Amino acid sequence: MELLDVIKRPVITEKSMLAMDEKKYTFEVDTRANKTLVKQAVESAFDVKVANVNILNVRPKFKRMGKYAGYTKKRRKAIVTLTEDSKEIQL
Amino acid sequence: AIKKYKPTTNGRRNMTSSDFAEITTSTPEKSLLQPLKNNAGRNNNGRITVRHQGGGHKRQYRVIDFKRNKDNVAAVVKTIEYDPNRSANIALVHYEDGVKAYILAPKGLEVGMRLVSGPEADIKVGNALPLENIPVGTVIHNIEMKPGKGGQLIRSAGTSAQVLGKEGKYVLIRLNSGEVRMILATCRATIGSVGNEQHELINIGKAGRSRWMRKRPTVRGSVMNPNDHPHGGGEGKTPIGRKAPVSPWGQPAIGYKTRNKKAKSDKLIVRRRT
Amino acid sequence: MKRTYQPNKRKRQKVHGFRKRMSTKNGRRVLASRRRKGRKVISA
RNA sequence: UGAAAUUUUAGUACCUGUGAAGAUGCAGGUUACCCGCGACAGGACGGAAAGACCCCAUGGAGCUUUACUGUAGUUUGAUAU
RNA sequence: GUAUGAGUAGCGAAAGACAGGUGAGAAUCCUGUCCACCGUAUGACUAAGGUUUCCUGGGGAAGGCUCGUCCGCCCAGGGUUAGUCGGGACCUAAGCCGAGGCCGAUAGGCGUAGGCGAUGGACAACAGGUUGAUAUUCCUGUACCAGUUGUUUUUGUUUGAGCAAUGGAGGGACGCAGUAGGCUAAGGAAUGCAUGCGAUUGGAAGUGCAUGUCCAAGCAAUGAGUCUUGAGUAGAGUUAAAUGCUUUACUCUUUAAGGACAAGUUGUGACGGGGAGCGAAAUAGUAGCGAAGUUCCUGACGUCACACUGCCAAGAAAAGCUUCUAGUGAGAAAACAACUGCCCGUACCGUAAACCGACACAGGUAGUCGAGGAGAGUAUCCUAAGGUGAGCGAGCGAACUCUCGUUAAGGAACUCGGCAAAAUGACCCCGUAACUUCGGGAGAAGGGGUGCUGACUUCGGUCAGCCGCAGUGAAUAGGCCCAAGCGACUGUUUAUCAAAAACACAGGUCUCUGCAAAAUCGUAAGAUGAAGUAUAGGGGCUGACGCCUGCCCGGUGCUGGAA
RNA sequence: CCCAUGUCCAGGUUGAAGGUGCGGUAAAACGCACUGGAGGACCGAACCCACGUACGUUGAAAAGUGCGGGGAUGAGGUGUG
Ligand SMILES: [K+]
Ligand SMILES: [K+]
Ligand SMILES: [K+]
Ligand SMILES: [K+]
Ligand SMILES: [K+]
Ligand SMILES: [K+]
Ligand SMILES: [K+]
Ligand SMILES: [K+]
Ligand SMILES: [K+]
Ligand SMILES: [K+]
Ligand SMILES: [K+]
Ligand SMILES: [K+]
Ligand SMILES: [K+]
Ligand SMILES: [K+]
Ligand SMILES: [K+]
Ligand SMILES: [K+]
Ligand SMILES: [K+]
Ligand SMILES: [K+]
Ligand SMILES: [K+]
Ligand SMILES: [K+]
Ligand SMILES: [K+]
Ligand SMILES: [K+]
Ligand SMILES: [K+]
Ligand SMILES: [K+]
Ligand SMILES: [K+]
Ligand SMILES: [K+]
Ligand SMILES: [K+]
Ligand SMILES: [K+]
Ligand SMILES: [K+]
Ligand SMILES: [K+]
Ligand SMILES: [K+]
Ligand SMILES: [K+]
Ligand SMILES: [K+]
Ligand SMILES: [K+]
Ligand SMILES: [K+]
Ligand SMILES: [K+]
Ligand SMILES: [K+]
Ligand SMILES: [K+]
Ligand SMILES: [Mg+2]
Ligand SMILES: [Mg+2]
Ligand SMILES: [Mg+2]
Ligand SMILES: [Mg+2]
Ligand SMILES: [Mg+2]
Ligand SMILES: [Mg+2]
Ligand SMILES: [Mg+2]
Ligand SMILES: [Mg+2]
Ligand SMILES: [Mg+2]
Ligand SMILES: [Mg+2]
Ligand SMILES: [Mg+2]
Ligand SMILES: [Mg+2]
Ligand SMILES: [Mg+2]
Ligand SMILES: [Mg+2]
Ligand SMILES: [Mg+2]
Ligand SMILES: [Mg+2]
Ligand SMILES: [Mg+2]
Ligand SMILES: [Mg+2]
Ligand SMILES: [Mg+2]
Ligand SMILES: [Mg+2]
Ligand SMILES: [Mg+2]
Ligand SMILES: [Mg+2]
Ligand SMILES: [Mg+2]
Ligand SMILES: [Mg+2]
Ligand SMILES: [Mg+2]
Ligand SMILES: [Mg+2]
Ligand SMILES: [Mg+2]
Ligand SMILES: [Mg+2]
Ligand SMILES: [Mg+2]
Ligand SMILES: [Mg+2]
Ligand SMILES: [Mg+2]
Ligand SMILES: [Mg+2]
Ligand SMILES: [Mg+2]
Ligand SMILES: [Mg+2]
Ligand SMILES: [Mg+2]
Ligand SMILES: [Mg+2]
């Protein structure tokens, strides 16, 4: 896939904001993207240098509106830790 | 010899076993071992084809050389060993070229004996010769029915056959069963008789010991139901109540011969027994 | 008091799984029957 | 907080008798003010199960054998290879 | 769909009480205090399974057997971070699939090479901290494994360092039982150490009370100890070769020497961390601070380690791994610097209200840890850590039913039957029959002792004294004997009305089977029997052991005979 | 029922064969001690089972519970595939 398609969007939550304080950013990524590809995509997109990348699979969450019940789409969440001496990602 | 256990318990009562005095070591040659799984009398279909088998102790197959076709060098008998697969004891022997092998243990075999194989081998216990080179009246074992196929006849503990005479391309032999028959003169055999002759005197003593030896209980047909066995059914204990006793599949179990009546080997069998 | 059903993911799939159904002709007959009837789930 | 089996409608006594021959309901007589609560289990041939015992059906099924007719296997011969 | 039964049965093992709070509303939600329950568990980990039930904030329609302000429910957001943990990119067992192939009305069955397949083998990281929810995953500190680039120092370039086979090898590599030893956890005691404190109910500033009383992986050194003879000469082998490995004969060595392992200990990791307790405001016991961490006793089947000893029933494979050359070779190695290392799981419940039982069900659910006194013990009673008060209650204290305690005198008169209950029960000592296969019977039977305080002991006792109705003062612990039938025995059986004299059994006997054995599955191929060979395998009957097993072959089977 | 591969059995008791020593003999047989630790061995938790009885019997439970009971190193229990 294309690097620009690897990363979908950032994750803004309390845990993600604490991560940012530690200079790590949480992104939703393509479910087929491995952490090495995620590292490459982040470097190309943001000019930063990546120290490490952690990655999790967020399972689909059951939901229901009225009489219809289904599942939210499965997601892939990546926590990217930038090295020192690296520009911060701005959101 | 046979050692008898004192009747400390009803199970131990009357039990006997072998002292394993002849056994000289308990460490089999790692090279000659092979894995064996317990088939429990079940064929590739998974059905029970032979009853009363399964369970029991694990075993490692020991590659026994029944062919004895290494005539080049002599083999020195290093050890006499117990073999779970067969009644007779085995013998580890080193060939002077460094090939290790297992053979059956003839009665009277001793560590250090230098056995030989081939037409020129002298007539001594443990040596292997083609039948044509064995003088009449000799006691032999580990006979093979096809040249190069390896010994098949006379391999159980204490068994032995005798050479009676020569004729044509065949040799006359009396087998352990008392049956007299012809065997191709090019077939080999080992001089002597299979050792461990005492094996027949062992008293198993308790059911659990049979279970160790992989024998599952045998249920008499007379105590089954009619749909299970021809003898099944009837109120209380009953006699056979048929023309003759029969197997679970109706085959008569007393005196009814089962050998194929057009057996090819009938031309070679001179006098039968059993 | 051990009941008939003892759940096991691996055993369920290996016995009733889609690939097990495909492996044999009659299993494919079952799948065809499920498709003809319109089952949402044709195999375990 | 909150069921169930059962349930033709019931204002649902006793004795003797009568009756498909063992009646809460029919006849004669006797007894009994109306509605309940706590207890018992004689009866409602009480509930539960279209009796398993017994008999019947030109019913079923499992089993047996010197029942009948077949047949897998086994065997013997002819013939082809 | 709605009645009747009926406002009836039931509301599913057990302890709650009060004060305060919240709220429209409180026995049922929150906080507090006391009380009570489990504690070889009702505690702590985990595999499977479930699949969001986890956290935060709201809600009280329905579900919760009452209520509910509350919940494993509903609504809205959020939560699972790995080169090292488990799995895959490693290996194989059973089993399964199966190129060609074999077999077969069709369909297909079987099966070789080759694969898949763990529950097994191999494999590099640990302590602490941190959030409301994750942590050997994040952070801190300090490591290790594989690899890349570079620098430097070494050394080889075709008489060639180095790498190195799918090949030759070694290795991996294994059973059960039994004690004995070492070491460490773990536990206990202490007028050891450190901190805090001095009671009010009569007494105690001391031998008073309470609490705590220690820390990795990795690196370096060392190591209780365990196992093992080691060389040389001549040969023969290891499809090719080998310096590797296997082995035959002959010399020296064999209380040794050499070699291979080894739990653990010491130091460093540690100026770090934890730690009794103290303790901040701005709003908690929270940042933060923080003492001591000794000796002695016991001591592990936890580990050395299947190490040793013994036994018969004789106890996986493969790869990783180490060598050998064959081949391949111009670059390799060491240090240092920097850098790279993918995918799946990671929440939560998990002797349960989250799994299997339709239920928030008295059932079932693999493995690990599982403390203290008395104690052999994980038994039993009461407790620690920790968890919990059971999802209807308040009264009353009738019959009747159930569960439980006691019972005058009698003591099986009950009853089909001593069914049930009662009684015996632990340890120590004395003593113990017929019979017997000489092992047993046997814990036979039947008796005695047991508490506490001194004295002495050879340390097990002894003597002396003291108290009670009673001393294994509670809980936990055989009732026994005589005789008969059946079965020898331990075992097995009708899941869910029968556990037995039934089955099995070791032993006995008969019979079939000469190996492509008989027997069985299959149309066949192909299998099991067997990688077995008549001392073996199949079938029938009998059923330990001891003494025995009589007569009949006319009939029916089987075996033989062949006119 | 079976295959492969794991795993579990607190704590006590008993004392087979073998061995050593001392007696005994001409040598022995044999006897007595010590050592040794066998067993479908003994007692008894967990675990497995399910003998008696009460209760339950629209049950807490479509087979259970309470109190007793048997086995508990084996022909054993049990997990995974
Ligand atoms: K016996
Ligand atoms: K054997
Ligand atoms: K039998
Ligand atoms: K019968
Ligand atoms: K459906
Ligand atoms: K009538
Ligand atoms: K009544
Ligand atoms: K029927
Ligand atoms: K109703
Ligand atoms: K009603
Ligand atoms: K709430
Ligand atoms: K594993
Ligand atoms: K090398
Ligand atoms: K380590
Ligand atoms: K250390
Ligand atoms: K986790
Ligand atoms: K103690
Ligand atoms: K305890
Ligand atoms: K409640
Ligand atoms: K009352
Ligand atoms: K009563
Ligand atoms: K009486
Ligand atoms: K009577
Ligand atoms: K007795
Ligand atoms: K007394
Ligand atoms: K007892
Ligand atoms: K019996
Ligand atoms: K028996
Ligand atoms: K008898
Ligand atoms: K029984
Ligand atoms: K039976
Ligand atoms: K007999
Ligand atoms: K037999
Ligand atoms: K018979
Ligand atoms: K038998
Ligand atoms: K006759
Ligand atoms: K006859
Ligand atoms: K019971
Ligand atoms: Mg991950
Ligand atoms: Mg048999
Ligand atoms: Mg029967
Ligand atoms: Mg029949
Ligand atoms: Mg009969
Ligand atoms: Mg009779
Ligand atoms: Mg009349
Ligand atoms: Mg009348
Ligand atoms: Mg009227
Ligand atoms: Mg009726
Ligand atoms: Mg009828
Ligand atoms: Mg009523
Ligand atoms: Mg309740
Ligand atoms: Mg207990
Ligand atoms: Mg919650
Ligand atoms: Mg909430
Ligand atoms: Mg409610
Ligand atoms: Mg195949
Ligand atoms: Mg958590
Ligand atoms: Mg005072
Ligand atoms: Mg060669
Ligand atoms: Mg130890
Ligand atoms: Mg977790
Ligand atoms: Mg009395
Ligand atoms: Mg009487
Ligand atoms: Mg009477
Ligand atoms: Mg009784
Ligand atoms: Mg007591
Ligand atoms: Mg019996
Ligand atoms: Mg028994
Ligand atoms: Mg039953
Ligand atoms: Mg029963
Ligand atoms: Mg019998
Ligand atoms: Mg026993
Ligand atoms: Mg269990
Ligand atoms: Mg017992």
Give a brief outline of the structure.
The structure is cut from a larger assembly and holds chains A (91 residues), B (274 residues) and C (44 residues). Chain A is of the alpha+beta class.
Major β-sheet annotation of chain C: none
Number of strands of chain B: 15
- What level of helicity do the residues of chain C show? 55-70%
- Lateral arrangement of strands in the main beta sheet of chain B: 9-14-10-11-12-13-15
**Proportion in helices of chain B:** under 10%
DSSP strand count of chain C: 0
What structural class do you assign from the helix and strand content of chain B?
A: mainly beta
| Structural classification of chain C | mainly alpha
The main pleated sheet of chain B reads as: 7 strands, antiparallel
> What radius of gyration of chain B results from the CA coordinates?
22 Å
Q: What oligomeric state do these chains adopt?
A: part of a larger assembly
Q: Give every kind of bound small molecule, once each.
A: potassium ion, magnesium ion
Shape of chain C: elongated
Overall 3D form of chain B: globular
For the termini of chain B, the CA-CA separation is 30 Å
Subunit structure (chain A): Part of the 50S ribosomal subunit. Contacts protein L29, and trigger factor when it is bound to the ribosome.
Organism (chain A): Enterococcus faecalis
Keywords (chain A): Ribonucleoprotein, Ribosomal protein, RNA-binding, rRNA-binding
Protein name (chain A): Large ribosomal subunit protein uL23
Account of the protein in words:
Chain A: GO terms for molecular function: rRNA binding; structural constituent of ribosome. Chain A: One of its GO terms (biological process) is translation. Chain A: Keywords: Ribonucleoprotein, Ribosomal protein, RNA-binding, rRNA-binding. This is part of a larger assembly, with chains A (91 residues), B (274 residues) and C (44 residues). Chain A is α+β, with helices and mostly antiparallel strands. Chain A contains three helices and six strands; from the N terminus they run αβαβαββββ. Chain A has helices at residues 3-6, 14-21, 35-46, and strands at residues 7-10, 24-29, 50-58, 62-65, 68-71, 75-82. In chain A, the strands form two sheets. In chain A, strands 1-2-6-3 form a four-stranded antiparallel β-sheet, sandwiched between helices. Chain A has a two-stranded antiparallel ribbon with strand order 4-5. Chain B has 274 residues and is an all-beta fold. Chain B is 2% helix and 23% strand. In chain B, strands 9-14-10-11-12-13-15 form a seven-stranded antiparallel β-sheet, with no helix packed on it. Chain B has a four-stranded antiparallel β-sheet with strand order 7-6-5-8, with no helix packed on it. In chain B, a hairpin with a 4-residue loop joins β6 and β7 (100-104). Chain C has one domain (1-44). By secondary structure, chain C is mostly helical. Chain C starts with 8 loop residues before the first helix and ends in a 7-residue tail after the last helix. In chain C, 61% of the residues lie in helices and 0% in strands. Classes of the chains: A alpha+beta (91), B mainly beta (274), C mainly alpha (44). The chains hardly touch. One potassium ion (K) binds next to loops of chain B. Chain B binds three RNA strands through α1.
